[PDB]
Design an enzyme around this catalytic site. Structure first.
Site, short mmCIF file in Angstrom:
data_model
loop_
_atom_site.label_atom_id
_atom_site.label_comp_id
_atom_site.label_asym_id
_atom_site.label_seq_id
_atom_site.Cartn_x
_atom_site.Cartn_y
_atom_site.Cartn_z
N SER A 1 1.17 -0.89 -0.18
CA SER A 1 -0.11 0.30 -0.39
C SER A 1 0.67 1.28 0.13
CB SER A 1 -1.05 -0.15 1.04
OG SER A 1 -2.02 0.44 1.15
N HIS B 1 -7.31 -6.63 1.61
CA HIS B 1 -6.51 -5.59 1.66
C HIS B 1 -4.46 -6.16 1.93
CE1 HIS B 1 -4.28 -1.76 1.16
NE2 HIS B 1 -4.67 -1.04 1.97
#
Length: 255
Positions: free
Chosen positions: A89, A234
């Protein structure tokens, strides 16, 4: 600037470039440890705390060119000419930004559940609210903090991830700065094309690397290769580390 790091020498010499692991927002150098524990078998490993996270220095500026420079300064500090970078990320965005700042310092690149795009949304307001609620309370232990956070969040995995940064009744990350600079973190500065194979590992149950970001992703990483991990959110490496490692090693071996 130089970052706080945890370095470990390869258990076996294989003439491979060292690997630098870079965590995401609200994370710390321990977050990609699951990957490091496997990759250290044949690579020197460097786990970093991104600025304003863990025990790395605090700075009011939080943008990708700055985070990329931190990686260069860190490599210089360790006297490493080139390394393979794996980032999750925000960390993936820092690594992608590094290709524009100092491409000669990068060998291979892996970006976990992230695309080089400005998402133009606020996705952490409840997390910030939970963090602030803990700080305002009298909570000292992670157990006490967890009780408060569950009043704001219903994803136990996210709560436990955040709590890794709750020590001595204080947050390791710089909350005011992460809030102030939030638009730049979820945001992005378009970079020139990096004409080298790059691995993207999206979570099948995550919107971070969906089709609407593909054109921009390819414009910056023409030779991008995507390996979607089915049934993963995620924090792909936290849910399916084995699948993530299989993808990483297939790419690193580049047969």
């Amino acid at each position: 600037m130089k970052l706080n790091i945890r370095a470990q020498t390869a258990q076996n010499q294989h003439n491979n470039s060292p690997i630098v692991l870079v965590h995401g927002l609200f994370g710390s150098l321990d977050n990609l440890g699951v990957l490091a524990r496997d990759l250290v078998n044949d690579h020197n490993i460097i786990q970093v705390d991104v600025r304003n996270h863990g025990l790395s220095p605090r700075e009011p500026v939080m943008n990708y060119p700055a985070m990329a420079q931190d990686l260069v300064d860190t490599l210089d500090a360790l006297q490493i000419d080139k390394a393979t970078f794996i980032g999750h990320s925000m960390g993936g965005k820092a690594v992608m930004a590094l290709t524009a700042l100092a491409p000669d310092r990068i060998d291979k690149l892996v970006a976990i559940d992230i695309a080089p795009v400005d998402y133009h949304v606020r996705r952490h307001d409840e997390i910030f609210a939970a963090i602030n609620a803990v700080s305002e309370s009298d909570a000292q232990t992670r157990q006490q903090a967890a009780a408060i956070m569950r009043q704001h969040l219903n994803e136990e995995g996210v709560i436990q991830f955040l709590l890794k940064s709750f020590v001595d009744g204080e947050w390791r990350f710089n909350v005011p700065v992460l809030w102030d600079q939030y638009p730049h973190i979820v945001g992005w500065e378009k970079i020139p094309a990096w004409d080298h194979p790059a691995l993207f590992i999206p979570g099948g149950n995550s919107p971070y690397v969906s089709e609407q970001y593909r054109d921009d992703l390819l414009a910056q990483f023409p030779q991008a290769r995507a390996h979607v991990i089915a049934g993963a959110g995620h924090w792909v490496h936290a849910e399916k580390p084995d699948a993530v490692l299989r993808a990483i090693r297939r790419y690193l071996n580049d047969h």
